[PDB]
Write a protein that binds this ligand. Structure first.
Ligand SMILES: CN1CCN(Cc2ccc(NCc3ccc(F)cc3)cc2)CC1
Ligand SMILES: CN1CCN(Cc2ccc(NCc3ccc(F)cc3)cc2)CC1
Ligand SMILES: CN1CCN(Cc2ccc(NCc3ccc(F)cc3)cc2)CC1
Ligand SMILES: CCCCCCCCCCCCCC(=O)O
Ligand SMILES: CCCCCCCCCCCCCC(=O)O
Ligand SMILES: CCCCCCCCCCCCCC(=O)O
Lengths: 59, 251, 278, 237, 59, 278, 60, 237, 278, 59
């Protein structure tokens, strides 16, 4: 029950680490700071009708 | 109709025509001790129809001012039929009980009784820090009366009804196996109590297995009738009784 | 087999519509001693609800699975009174009120025990306090029933050869250990409605069944030029627990450590009248 | 040996930890187990059992047992109130010391529905009808039967079946409520009113009594184990 | 001789932990607080004859 | 299965050449509330660039995943005033300004908590300082809402049987633990535009929703001949976090711990004129 | 037991560490999650939103 | 290195722990083992061996060896008691210092049956019968043969076989009994009475003696290792 | 093979009914030296019983597997008498009575040894106690027979090159180690009924076979301005044990550490008469 | 090189523990207190000719 995953590194320079949980409560686990998904559409494009950048904004 | 029940143990029978359902302890029916749980080595006696039979204790009077009564077992049956003799002559015992309480009144009477069996009903003395003998809480089959006011005599148990002599709320006794006798729709209550203890067997003269309490929550009332009191009677019948360790008879 | 792999939720509401029939779930009879099993769906229109609440925290194991203080006591490193330089406590769980009430909600219990000891020291006030003393050490001794009991700090009985003991030095983590189920019977009994003698005479109550032993504590060899006082706290933590025959919680305040004696108490508080709701 | 580094929290004593420790009595033989009747595996099982509620706290009860009986009479002014109480199972004096309030007082959060069962303990020849209503939280409790009827309620008819059950639904903005309830987490009120009145024939008592039983449904639950405030001591026993 | 089991978590949010026993006495093991079986019938329905909620309690 | 195996980069510039057409990416209309998605490639000639920068450090988990002080307090081992020998702090995150502002950038939060306690002691000045005292010990007690509250250092409530507590000795590592999500609602709320009573009266603001409890600290049994003062610092570290509805950061200085009250402040600093760039 | 040796940095408190710790409320049941609108997963999303710039800082 | 956190109990010295430790004499060569006769692997094996019981503790024994002999005579009043003792193997003075009592005194709990063997050491021409009875716990010990006979007993006939065995069954309410026995865990009594009387021909001694042997059955067991109270010292030897 | 997988119960009663035959299990003859193997089923009617009791705790390994004190001794950091500043103990197990009696229940023993040392220090009383001294350190030295013996605290022999030694600092856990079976013979002998010389003269008893060596202890370099006294306790814990030829436990009190000398003692206590049972 | 064996428990209530040896000397191992073999015949029946309990001891 050991999880092996890559660790942060650079662009062109064994980049693996092992983790095991010792407690029965999920609140005792370490921070899951390895998620990098994001989507700014909710705040940048809240309009109803999709607008194309190339075409005029209105008409 | 499900309002009529008949019970037959040994050479005695009980018939009721206006009874509620039957409460069975904690869902466990009385049974004999198994081979893989026993500790004593010698063969157990099993008087069957001789000890297992209904035995009616003395009857009590219910007045408008009654507060309640209690009985402790098997000290209540300690001097009843062959059951008492077997208790006297043996060191160890084990048996379940079936309790039946009778109380009947006309349709113009009103009142409610609580019938409950309390296992290990340890009681505290009237004066904190003063011991009591084995007579203020059990003297045979006679009933002991609760008191409305706080007890003051040091030689007897604290009989405060609202505390039930156990330091707990009287209204919380519903947790134990119990039944209600409501004069509107019921005359009797039936409870089947299996053997409950921390050991397979125990001496029936040293240890009180459980205590039976009858408390009128709604005081009796009536008007313009020739009946002045409503008698209450209690009947008990040991079940699956067995003994062990025969010896000279306890005085 | 280097590895060996080893979600209960409360009931869900179901949609209910208008009804008109001879069935009467709302009507019952408490005289039978049976608690009604009716649900809100049986007396009003309800929507479908998926409930994810769980009763995990209400289990007896978790309810009793907390360490609680059961005994405190003070002993001095040096003093004129011999009896004041060590402690001798008969084991019992009726000393502290909170744990006593928590345990007394059940008639019979069966569990393992985890004991933790917290020890602290302080230097007694005086006219001259300047001194230098290395770290102190303490010994905890357990004497099962019938064993020899020390009569002084430097008694021979402190050479335990069969009696378990712990030696602890100040500044480290508190001492800890485990104790199995050590009852002669099949389960511990919080209450005992009976006597000691066969003729219904002698001791009465749970005091008759308390034969767990004693605990002794002393300073190993510390003897300061000036008095130093130390205090020990004992904590019990049931594990792998089982209970039978629940009983109503106590209402009256405790008054004795080995008896059920009490004073009558009102059922509850009062209010202006039956209709007051403000 | 193996390199290691201690993290914060080492050598601390947490009263709610789960760690292995050495046994002081190695190879001890425990007594064989026996199946005593009435095993309890969850406090909720106790919580689901009925118990008598002391509704008659009139500040003038010279007899304690009177607290359990709700008075009733013949020739009652039409549409009168029988009783009224606030729904705080863990804080209100009515539910404070009940078999359910005692359990809740060991916790901080609670949720689910509740059951209130009423039993008529009058004469067999007596008859009557009662209206029992539950009013969700609001700025004002009801003061008349017309106001009370608007909320959840049930019409109770007294007959051969001497008991009726009022199921209080779980209506709340939050998944849980505090045992130490406040204005934010108020729960409402419960009241009972005469529907038709009590009528008796000649030769019967002019008064009767009612009793109330409180218990939890199968969707009830509790959380956050706290220490109860009802018990305290001043000196070592 | 290592036991792998799930740890407590929420409804819609590696939830695994490993345990090993170091002592020869079962009393030294950690609390087994992961059991959630319960049955209130023993105290709520102690009657002999089964009663149906829908039908009248008596007759 | 003894093992179980478990790189996002910012956008890359693309080559752009001369253009002459009717398309006008540069022209838009902010009236729609839509932020333009134009890129430098759309308004000038650009080369092809591969960018390896990542936004890993900008995630909310990392932004809020730092321990910050939230409360300090001092208590003496011995003194005449009973209230001065222990601390009683209602839990809240509005006491320290930095963490308050960091948290207040979002309307709703949901996270686990990691609490660390730092305790230090110092001997008070006086005319006579010579004394010898063993290592001190401290107890941290948490009382959920509605539980009993101690009134003195040696009160009975310090015998916690259900309330979690920690006993810590000076010289070791700071105490640490974890706390789950303990809100009655589905998420913590930093702001609450509402009242307590249903008639729009009573308490107003986030003070109505603060029902987290209290924290108590004391010296276990230490009582020196001369006063000794100790200080405790509490640090909070959100874990497994989620946020909703971001809001602009605060501009005015804080003035109350349980209110949004403020004083008007200028938008920003000034300069000689609109053309000054030096 | 197992031989071991402590390395530098033991018993230190680093405000940006990632370690497991015991839970003070074992077997606590958390409230079910709900998808509130407007979830933010990165401060850059906020950073990409337009805002009015106070250019006319004329000291008067 | 590897992150770690110390739990409570670290650096403590528990006298009943099981941990590995370094060897102070690495690569030491031990002497080859040899199978000496009479290997003992369990104290119960010692406990099962018979030993003489000093029943004759009459407080007037000027000769110590007299404690082991139970007197007997001719022309005995009919139905007389030969001896009587309480069944406390670990506490009663009779069984205190026996080969079995010594073993039990190192423990706290015991259970199982016991064996009492009686041997007649009179003349070859002498004859007689004796009744030996075991009385389970009760409010009063027996005072006559009629009372004694009611419990478990055996009729012993003296002949070519000079020894008879009384097996005391394990009759108790608990699985175990305390070595420091009390009223709660009492075990009963054992007594011997004349059944027919002793008859001798001319030219033989008028008195004889009997001896008792005590041992444990194959179902006996002990528990909870404690320190014995029989041995103590005041100064270093 | 990363893993390698590696319940005895006392006899059960069997049901017995009425019997009438020539077999006489109750009758036997002790003259043969044979202990009767009769069971309660052979002399009375019995029920069937399944017994789960086990004799695990009665094994010799567990009986002797407890640490017990064997020697105490005090030595001062600084004093005028050279011999008072260090300890020199010839190894033997006859010094402490409890362990001596426990071991003497068998004639021959063969086991490994586990030795634990507990050391405590205290500052001696005086007219001037104010001083500051860092943590002390202690050295434990073992000298097999025939090796050099130090004559003072600062002797050259304390530079052990082959003799094992341990250096220990106050405040840490007690020192511990293991010792193998180091007897020249095939097993340790608690008793020796023989002489030293071939003509039956000289030393008599187990003193002739005691050639285990010596143990020396000192303060490494501590020399306080004021005297400080330290005490050391030695604990022995047999492991992997085997015993032969059991013998009756001792009855008379011990009087010499290297002899069986004793004073006659009564067999047991007395009572009013042979019939007294009260 | 890890040994897995059962640990002591009761009659009707993962009862496994793991052990590893770190030292090169067998004297450093932990106590082997899991052996429960016994034979009292050596002291209870030291006679030459076997005697049956049922039959008379002599003749
Ligand atoms: C009659 N009461 C029944 C309940 N019982 C509770 C109880 C159970 C176990 C202990 N163990 C104390 C202990 C003994 C030795 C040791 F090494 C550690 C702890 C105490 C109370 C009390 C009696
Ligand atoms: C109304 N405010 C909303 C934000 N909320 C932040 C917050 C969340 C959790 C805690 N936990 C404090 C704590 C309690 C007990 C314990 F053992 C450890 C830590 C505090 C603040 C504050 C209220
Ligand atoms: C003649 N007696 C026979 C029994 N024997 C018991 C005994 C066995 C071993 C030791 N070892 C002491 C020891 C020596 C060196 C060391 F590093 C650690 C412990 C002592 C007594 C005593 C003699
Ligand atoms: C409480 C857990 C302690 C874990 C101790 C370190 C790991 C020992 C087992 C080796 C890793 C395998 C774990 C697994 O099977 O997933
Ligand atoms: C006394 C036991 C010490 C265990 C030390 C950690 C585990 C080392 C072995 C790796 C885990 C495998 C255990 C197994 O085979 O079940
Ligand atoms: C000096 C020995 C150190 C052992 C450290 C713990 C065990 C690490 C390896 C995992 C267990 C496998 C052992 C084996 O192969 O038998």
């Amino acid at each position: 029950g050991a999880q092996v995953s890559t660790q942060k590194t650079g662009a062109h320079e064994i980049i693996h680490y092992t983790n095991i949980n010792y407690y029965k409560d999920a609140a005792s686990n370490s921070a899951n700071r390895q998620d990098f998904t994001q989507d700014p559409s909710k705040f940048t494009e809240p309009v109803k009708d999709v607008m194309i950048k190339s075409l005029p904004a209105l008409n | 109709s499900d309002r009529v029940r008949s019970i037959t143990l040994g050479n005695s029978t009980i018939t009721t025509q206006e009874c509620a359902n039957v409460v069975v302890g904690y869902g466990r029916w009385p049974t004999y001790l198994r081979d893989d749980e026993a500790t004593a080595e010698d063969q157990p006696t099993q008087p069957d129809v001789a000890t297992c039979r209904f035995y009616t204790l003395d009857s009590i009077k219910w007045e408008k001012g009654s507060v309640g009564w209690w009985w402790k077992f098997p000290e209540a049956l300690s001097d009843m039929g062959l059951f008492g003799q077997n208790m006297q002559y043996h060191y160890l015992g084990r048996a379940g009980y079936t309790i039946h309480v009778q109380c009947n009144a006309s349709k113009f009477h009103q009142g409610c009784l609580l019938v409950v069996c309390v296992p290990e009903a340890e009681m505290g003395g009237a004066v904190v820090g003063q011991a009591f003998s084995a007579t203020a809480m059990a003297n045979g089959d006679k009933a002991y009366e609760f008191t409305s006011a706080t007890q003051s005599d040091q030689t007897k148990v604290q009989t405060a009804i609202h505390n039930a002599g156990m330091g707990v709320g009287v209204g919380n006794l519903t947790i134990y196996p119990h039944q209600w006798i409501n004069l509107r729709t019921n005359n009797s209550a039936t409870i089947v109590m299996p053997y409950i203890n921390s050991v397979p067997m125990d001496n029936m003269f040293r240890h009180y297995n459980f205590t039976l309490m009858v408390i009128p929550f709604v005081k009796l009332d009536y008007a313009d009738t020739a009946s002045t009191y409503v008698p209450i009677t209690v009947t008990v019948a040991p079940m699956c009784a067995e003994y062990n360790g025969l010896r000279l008879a306890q005085a | 087999g280097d590895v060996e792999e080893a979600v209960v939720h409360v009931a869900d509401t179901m949609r209910s519509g208008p009804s008109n029939s001879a069935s009467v779930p709302a009507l019952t009879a408490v005289e039978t001693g049976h608690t009604s099993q009716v649900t809100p769906s049986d007396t009003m229109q309800t929507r479908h609800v998926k409930n994810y609440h769980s009763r995990s925290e209400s289990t007896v194991e978790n309810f009793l699975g907390r360490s609680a203080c059961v005994y405190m006591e003070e002993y001095k490193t040096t003093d004129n009174d011999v009896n004041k330089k060590f402690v001798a406590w008969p084991i019992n769980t009726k000393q502290m009120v909170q744990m006593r009430r928590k345990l007394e909600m059940f008639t019979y219990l069966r569990f393992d025990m985890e004991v933790t000891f917290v020890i602290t020291s302080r230097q007694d006030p005086g006219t001259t306090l300047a001194q230098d003393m290395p770290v102190l050490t303490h010994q905890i001794m357990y004497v099962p029933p019938g064993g020899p009991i020390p009569a002084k700090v430097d008694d021979y009985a402190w050479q335990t050869s069969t009696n378990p003991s712990i030696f602890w030095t100040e500044g480290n983590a508190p001492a800890r250990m485990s104790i199995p189920f050590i009852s002669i019977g099949n389960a511990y009994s919080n209450f005992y409605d009976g006597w000691s003698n066969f003729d219904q005479r002698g001791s009465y109550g749970y005091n008759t069944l308390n034969n767990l032993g004693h605990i002794y504590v002393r300073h190993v060899s510390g003897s300061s030029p000036h008095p130093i006082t130390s205090t020990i706290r004992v904590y019990f933590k049931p594990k792998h627990t089982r209970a039978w025959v629940p009983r109503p919680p106590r209402l009256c305040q405790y008054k004795k450590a080995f008896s059920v004696d009490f004073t009558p108490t009102p059922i509850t508080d009062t209010r202006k009248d039956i209709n007051t709701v403000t | 040996g193996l390199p290691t580094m201690n993290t914060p929290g080492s050598t601390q004593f947490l009263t709610s930890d789960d760690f292995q420790s050495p046994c002081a009595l190695p190879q001890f033989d425990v007594t064989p187990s026996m199946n005593i009747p009435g095993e309890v595996k969850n406090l909720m099982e106790i919580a689901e059992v009925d118990s008598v509620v002391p509704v008659n706290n009139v500040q003038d009860t010279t007899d304690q047992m009177e607290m359990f009986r709700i008075p009733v009479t013949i020739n009652a002014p039409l549409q009168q109130q029988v009783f009224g109480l606030r729904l705080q199972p863990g804080l209100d004096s009515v539910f404070k010391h009940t078999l359910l309030g005692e359990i809740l007082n060991y916790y901080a959060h609670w949720s689910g529905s509740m059951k209130l069962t009423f039993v008529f303990c009058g004469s067999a020849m007596a008859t009557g009808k009662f209206l029992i209503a539950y009013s969700p939280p609001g700025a004002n409790p009801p003061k008349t039967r017309k106001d009370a009827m608007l909320g959840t309620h049930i019409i109770w008819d007294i007959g051969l079946q001497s008991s009726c059950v009022l199921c209080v639904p779980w209506i709340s903005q939050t998944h849980y409520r505090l045992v130490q309830q406040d204005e934010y987490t108020s729960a409402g009120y419960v009241t009972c009113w005469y529907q038709t009145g009590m009528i008796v024939p000649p030769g019967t008592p002019n008064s009767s009594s009612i009793m109330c039983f409180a218990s939890a449904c199968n969707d009830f639950s509790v959380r956050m184990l706290r220490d109860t405030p009802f018990i305290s001591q001043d000196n070592k026993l």
